[PDB]
Write a protein that binds this ligand. Structure first.
Ligand SMILES: Cc1cc2nc3c(=O)[nH]c(=O)nc-3n(C[C@H](O)[C@H](O)[C@H](O)COP(=O)(O)O)c2cc1C
Lengths: 847, 141, 353, 94
């Protein structure tokens, strides 16, 4: 329908007035901008001149009535926090917004038996009033009609779930930087949408008042400096650092020598002139790397200066350090898609959902007065519109995955323009895919450009156990990756200096034999570390401890490790080699920014140490190779041995499938438990690897030879035990195979000393293994290791969240939780004093 | 074969005024063989076969009496498979005749042929593996 | 703006827009009504005069509506309120069923895979061919095993013997599609040297050109709402007014022999209840006339291949083309004066008695 | 519960699990089922010399997740650091 848009008349004292009217308002009641012009017939050539005084104020007043549901007060300190309003997300406000920007994601559409989710885009609808208020104060005097939007982004605070339809949202805007530039005034605002006390996401907008400003007294800038890493190598290095008054650590006595420092700095600046700063603050924590690679606060950067000209602290750290950037590029950008988009026929739809009643976008006479190409499409529209594309095609329409998005409004777009926007995968950051996009119009002009961080698919890391170690394994990666070198070298050094061998050598060229030489003063230092290898054995209260290295004593000149094949396949070396290769590889992945935050992990026997080390940094690189190395010496020693060093035990790898299609897991369990009790020997199922396919049993070689033969029988006999269990009684089939057992058990007991296990129909002997580990046989060797572990896995390196819910042990097969519930299951599977007390008095709750 | 039948249909359009006896044999026949079912192909091709007046459709293989053969004449056979009545124009008897007084089949051989217990179409597939009703498949040179 | 799109093809929206139900339901009906009219007008009949020659009528899915409305028809002056009833029903079916379950972005990864596996572009209705109704229901029962109530798929159409149509959310129908993808066999497998019994299932399956899950639990919500709406406008179908049998989609019965509302039935018959097409085409006749959408790709030919040998002769009323087989007939027969316009399909039982 | 207290506890639990892992058997079947089904991993990555635990998790999928995967339309991807560098580091050919 038709309506008044402009009203032109005279006023008192020769003042032309152009009433500029906007009909689309907050309450239906038209608002008006009073434009005033001095008519003066004494200047025939330029009669009309504009009344400039309070011009900005009139424009601001009209924008206020359209944006702000509050009283017109232009008297904020720009420095004061702006509180927003609480905001309940209605089901329908979402419907309207999604449809306005064109986001057809199913996460936002009401479906049966699912709560409706709100688009991260919706943050702007919530915070718009809190944010926009920030460019209004008198001390930031702009012409709102020449206002320009530069950028806007959303950042999700980690751990925060996305906005939902239920949520009530508190909004807070602060204004981070306001700086006068050559070309105009720039205001950087930050929103923080919180929910239920906790902060949920941050919104960033920067606006631009074009023009010439001298406002310097009302200008300020905060910036978050990148983290600077500094490798204190020499003695003068530490001297120069102590020379600066801003370098201020807690204990001055701290040994900086040979540590690595990080400087997490924020610099707050206030201008007083064109180029000269009025004041420069620069503060932040100084941190030191631990062996775990964790970082602990050591002190402070505390700089302060008036009438500055530059930032000395940052300049120092620039030249005297390196700059850690968390973004890591891929090798080549990977194209994702190029997509066709359109701007809306009218802008009213977006304006209604968003609360941006800015006439520039809706009323042609305002657009034209500001000298725009027409009724420009809401930049904010294209933000959400393009974002939708990234959401669909880059995150496979999993709303959840995009956790960061940002947008630069390069140029303007009119309604009914077509927009090819293209999207590539450019790099990684902290496990998230870094995605860059660029949107051009029909005239091939760039109009939009931003980036997005997108979560990787649900990832689980599994760390390999022994058995597959190859000579030279992961030695290629040692040659290319820095992360790798550091891991290996730290370890190789520790091994050289405490046991007198190189784990790199062993891996690089599998040595048939290897002798340690206890040479000079360092030779003798080494051999004591060999001489203190203890294997404790709690047997009925008694602690039977023995030297692991029998022969190394005060008169030994050397020891020698032996292996006919090659020492890389002797577990004491195998284990470090594996743990090392893996920990190195993972740390390269971590360095390329490829490790998802919420990734779950588990390791298989040995790999569980590598897994704990890699994902949770529970121990130093050296602590790892140590623990793992002793774990191997331990295994080598817990079984009685021959002259030729033979074993009374071994392991058999079974496949219930090959015996009979009928032969289940309960059937293999049953069969092995009977041959266990019957022969009074030792067989237990040690590896539960693949259901109905891959199992491993260990124990008495004789018991292994019975089970392997009992099995062979049941196959050629076609004995469905699930069926005989129905037709006969427990005692009936029990005895039935007790007889089968007893005819095979005779045969193997009558066999020579260290029986040679041979192949079966579903049984394969695991050549190599001699210890019945992962059986009960090693329960006595627990409490000497349980102290060894406690001496190497310090309390302070166990950060709970790194493990909770993500770490799948092997004892338990259930995700690490520090709950009464969990603690009990462990006791049940093990019976341990330390645990039992804890379960028993769980109410140690309060400090 | 289903394709083979479709071939005959084409030889049929070839000379629409010429009588062509389409002897549809099955897989359960004597001598030369086929991995094909006796009902599926016919059940499937019948409508097309029947739009050519020059085609005289003849069901063969597995027949021995007027009695088992009758339903294929009524067209009632095709009913077991929820299909419209599908009547045939004639029947051939290959095995059934091998005992007749006037075939040259030797005495001891006629005796051998008789004493073979048959087997329903239900279980002819077993010729490929075991002797089935005293009859196996075997491959020519 | 239907009139606009017609005049300036340039202005016609995407197939994607045209296909979504709220506009596609009513339009399809107009197409059918329009076909009825060229047949009636061109024969020299009134709407009702045409209707009198009919032993009865029936629709498939949303086609039921126009069949009901067609039989309520008498004279040209009166023809238009009959049109109003039909399309104002379709309009509400469309608008309300869309609102109930509106299409949402397909994860491009799925669309990608479903495409390089020669299946369709994922939609709410999948069609499986050469599988038992039992066989099909088996695979769906398995698929549904792993899904929540609101994501489950059911049989929508039993269009025929081994021809079915499952329906539900596109993504869960895609899941059924995967479980099927392993159970089948490459089309040119040549199992000609494999004994019959021992061979592998060959079968076809594709998504259908539709925006909505018809005949599924996804739409039940819009049932009561549509009817509440149908009452708020003039629309209702009294059994008094329908002049010829209108065979129920599920029963196969007449809609006139009905205690309750006939409107409410055909609403629930399109929105919630399956279509047992063969049982709903129980009747016996010489000739079936197809006024419904889509030339020889339409309902006529489907029903024809159901009946083949039984002397029923389908005629596609909306397309002037040519059948090389004379399998069925096209638009022409409905109007021909020669004995060439009276063709009948064979009944093998009689022909070859 | 107090943060420092949680550590102290969680610590000894961690050391317990590691000490006794020595004797108790390796419940890998149960484990795979935790991350395969409870977590619904789409990228399970094996970090080792060769692809042993991978083909383990692969067999497990064919043996048990045949149907689950299909219906729930979840594409799973099983990668070994050993052999699938391209796919882990996101660096392909043309
Ligand atoms: C001993 C014997 C010899 C045959 N010789 C021929 C032949 O030379 N040419 C041919 O087209 N079919 C030949 N057949 C196939 C039969 O003509 C007919 O197709 C088949 O036997 C019918 O199957 P039935 O014996 O079960 O009724 C022969 C079948 C048998 C049992």
């Amino acid at each position: 329908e038709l309506k008044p848009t402009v009203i032109l008349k005279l006023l008192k004292e020769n003042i032309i007035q152009m009433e500029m009217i906007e009909n689309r308002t907050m309450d239906g009641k038209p608002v008006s901008l009073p434009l005033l012009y001095n008519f003066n017939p004494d200047n025939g050539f330029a009669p009309i001149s504009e009344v400039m005084e309070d011009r900005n104020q009139r424009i601001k007043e009209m924008y206020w009535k359209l944006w702000i549901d509050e009283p017109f007060n232009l008297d904020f300190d720009p420095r004061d926090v702006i509180k927003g309003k609480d905001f309940e997300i209605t089901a329908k406000e979402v419907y309207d917004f999604t449809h306005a920007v064109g986001n057809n994601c199913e996460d936002f559409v009401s479906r049966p038996d699912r709560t409706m989710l709100a688009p991260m885009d919706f943050a702007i609808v919530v915070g718009w009033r809190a944010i926009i208020k920030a460019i209004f104060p008198n001390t930031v005097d702009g012409d709102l009609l020449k206002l320009v939007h530069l950028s806007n982004g959303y950042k999700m605070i980690p751990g925060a779930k996305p906005l939902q339809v239920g949520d009530v949202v508190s909004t807070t805007a602060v204004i981070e930087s306001v700086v006068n530039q050559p070309t105009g005034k720039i205001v950087d605002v930050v929103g923080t949408l919180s929910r239920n006390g906790k902060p949920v996401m941050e919104v960033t907008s920067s606006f631009f008042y074009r023009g010439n400003y001298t406002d310097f007294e009302n200008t300020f800038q905060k910036t978050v400096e990148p983290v600077y890493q500094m490798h204190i190598k020499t003695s003068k290095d530490i001297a120069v650092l102590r020379s600066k008054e801003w370098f201020q650590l807690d204990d001055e006595d701290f040994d900086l020598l040979n540590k690595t420092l990080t400087f997490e700095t924020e610099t707050e600046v206030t201008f007083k002139n064109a180029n000269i700063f009025s004041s420069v603050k620069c503060f932040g924590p100084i941190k030191v790397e631990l062996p775990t690679k964790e970082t602990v606060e050591i002190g402070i950067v505390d700089y302060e200066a008036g009438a500055s000209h530059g930032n000395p602290v940052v300049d120092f750290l620039k030249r005297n350090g390196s700059t850690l950037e968390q973004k890591v590029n891929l090798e080549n950008p990977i194209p994702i898609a190029v997509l066709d988009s359109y701007t809306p026929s009218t802008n009213e739809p977006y304006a209604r959902v968003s609360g941006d009643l800015n006439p520039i976008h809706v009323s042609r006479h305002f657009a034209s007065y500001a000298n725009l190409p027409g009724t420009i499409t809401h930049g904010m529209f294209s933000s959400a519109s393009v974002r939708a594309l990234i959401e669909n095609w880059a995150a496979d329409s999993v709303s959840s995955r995009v956790r960061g998005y940002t947008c630069q409004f390069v140029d303007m777009v009119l309604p009914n323009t077509a927009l090819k926007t293209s999207i590539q995968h450019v790099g990684m950051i902290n496990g998230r895919k870094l995605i860059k996009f660029e949107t051009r119009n029909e005239d091939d002009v760039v109009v939009l450009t931003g980036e997005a961080e997108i979560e990787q698919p649900v990832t689980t890391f599994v760390f390999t156990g022994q058995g597959s170690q190859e000579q030279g394994m992961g030695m290629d990666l040692y040659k290319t990756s820095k992360a790798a070198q550091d891991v290996w070298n730290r370890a190789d050094n520790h091994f050289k200096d405490t046991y007198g061998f190189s784990i790199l050598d062993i891996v690089i060229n599998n040595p048939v034999n290897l002798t340690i030489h206890f040479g000079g003063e360092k030779g003798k230092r080494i051999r004591e570390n060999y001489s203190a290898m203890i294997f404790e054995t709690i047997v009925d209260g008694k602690l039977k401890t023995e030297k692991i290295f029998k022969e190394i004593n005060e008169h030994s000149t050397s020891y020698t490790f032996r292996s006919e094949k090659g020492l890389l396949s002797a577990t004491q070396f195998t284990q470090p080699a594996l743990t090392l290769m893996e920990k190195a590889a993972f740390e390269d992945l971590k360095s390329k920014g490829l490790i998802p935050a919420d990734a779950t992990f588990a390791g298989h026997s040995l790999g569980e140490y590598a897994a704990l080390a890699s994902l949770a940094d529970v121990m130093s690189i050296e602590s790892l190779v140590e623990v793992v190395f002793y774990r191997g010496m331990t295994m080598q020693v817990a079984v009685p041995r021959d002259e030729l060093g033979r074993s009374n035990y071994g392991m058999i790898a079974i496949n219930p499938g090959r015996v009979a299609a009928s032969f289940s897991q309960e059937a293999l369990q049953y069969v092995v438990e009977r041959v266990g009790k019957r022969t009074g020997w030792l067989v237990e199922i040690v590896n539960y690897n693949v259901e109905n396919q891959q199992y491993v049993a260990a124990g008495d070689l004789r018991a292994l030879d019975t089970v392997t033969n009992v099995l062979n029988f049941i196959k050629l006999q076609k004995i469905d035990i699930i069926e005989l269990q129905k037709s006969l009684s427990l005692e009936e089939v029990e005895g039935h195979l007790f007889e089968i057992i007893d005819e095979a058990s005779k045969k193997s007991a009558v066999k020579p000393r260290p029986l040679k296990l041979e192949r079966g129909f579903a049984c394969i002997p695991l050549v190599g293994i001699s210890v019945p580990f992962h059986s009960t046989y090693l329960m006595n060797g627990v409490k000497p290791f349980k102290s060894f572990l406690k001496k190497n896995i310090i309390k302070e390196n166990v950060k709970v969240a790194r493990l909770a819910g993500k770490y799948i042990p092997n004892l338990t097969a259930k995700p690490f939780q520090v709950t009464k519930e969990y603690f009990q299951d462990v006791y049940d599977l093990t019976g341990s004093e330390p645990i039992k007390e804890i379960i028993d008095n769980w109410e140690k709750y309060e400090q | 074969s289903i394709d083979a039948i479709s071939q005959v249909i084409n030889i049929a359009k070839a000379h629409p005024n010429f009588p062509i006896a389409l002897q549809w044999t099955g897989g359960r026949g004597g001598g030369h063989h086929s991995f094909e079912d006796a009902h599926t192909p016919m059940l499937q091709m019948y409508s097309k076969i029947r739009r050519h007046p020059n085609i005289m459709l003849i069901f063969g293989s597995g027949f021995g009496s007027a009695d088992d053969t009758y339903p294929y004449l009524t067209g009632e056979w095709s009913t077991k498979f929820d299909y419209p009545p599908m009547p045939f124009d004639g029947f051939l008897f290959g095995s059934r005749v091998m005992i007749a007084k006037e075939v040259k089949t030797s005495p001891d051989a006629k005796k051998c042929i008789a004493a073979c217990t048959g087997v329903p179409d239900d279980k002819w597939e077993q010729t490929y593996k075991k002797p089935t009703g005293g009859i196996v498949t075997v491959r020519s040179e | 703006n239907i009139l606009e799109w017609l005049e300036n093809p340039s202005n016609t929206p995407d197939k994607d827009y045209l296909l979504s139900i709220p506009i596609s339901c009513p339009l399809i009906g107009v197409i059918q009504l329009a076909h009825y009219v060229v047949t009636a007008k061109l024969l020299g009949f009134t709407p009702g005069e045409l209707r009198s020659y009919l032993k009865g009528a029936t629709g498939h899915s949303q086609g039921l509506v126009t069949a009901v409305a067609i039989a309520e028809t008498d004279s040209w002056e009166s023809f238009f309120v009959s049109v109003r009833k039909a399309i104002t029903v379709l309009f509400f079916i469309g608008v309300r069923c869309y609102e109930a379950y509106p299409n949402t972005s397909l994860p491009p990864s799925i669309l990608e895979d479903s495409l390089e596996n020669n299946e369709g572009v994922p939609s709410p209705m999948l069609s499986i061919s050469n599988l038992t109704q039992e066989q099909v229901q088996d695979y769906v029962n398995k698929t549904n095993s792993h899904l929540p109530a609101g994501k489950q798929v059911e049989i929508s159409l039993v269009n025929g013997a081994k021809n079915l149509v499952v329906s539900g959310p596109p993504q869960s129908l895609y899941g059924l599609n995967l479980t099927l993808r392993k159970a089948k066999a490459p089309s040119g497998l040549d199992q000609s040297r494999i004994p019959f019994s021992e061979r592998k299932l060959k079968f076809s399956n594709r998504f259908l050109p539709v925006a909505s899950p018809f005949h599924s639990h996804l739409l039940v919500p819009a049932s009561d709402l549509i009817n509440k709406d149908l009452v708020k406008n003039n629309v209702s179908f009294n059994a008094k007014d329908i002049q010829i049998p209108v065979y129920d989609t599920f029963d196969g019965s007449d809609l006139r022999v009905l205690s309750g509302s006939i409107s409410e039935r055909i609403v629930d018959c399109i929105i919630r209840l399956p279509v047992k097409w063969e049982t709903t085409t129980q009747f016996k006749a010489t000739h079936i006339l197809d006024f419904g959408p889509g030339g020889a790709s339409g309902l006529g030919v489907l029903t024809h291949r159901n009946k083949d040998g039984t002397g029923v002769r389908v005629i596609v009323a909306g397309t002037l083309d040519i059948n090389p087989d004379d399998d069925y007939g096209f638009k022409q027969e409905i109007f021909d004066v020669t004995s060439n316009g009276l063709k009948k399909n064979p009944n093998w039982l009689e022909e070859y008695h | 519960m107090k943060p420092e207290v949680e550590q102290e506890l969680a610590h000894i639990l961690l050391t317990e699990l590691l000490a006794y892992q020595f004797a108790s058997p390796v419940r890998w079947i149960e484990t795979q089922d935790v991350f395969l089904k409870d977590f619904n991993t789409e990228r399970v990555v094996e970090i080792g010399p060769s692809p042993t635990l991978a083909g383990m998790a692969q067999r497990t999928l064919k043996n048990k997740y045949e149907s689950y995967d299909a219906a729930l339309s979840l594409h799973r991807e099983i990668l070994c650091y050993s052999k699938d560098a391209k796919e882990i580091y996101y660096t392909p050919d043309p």
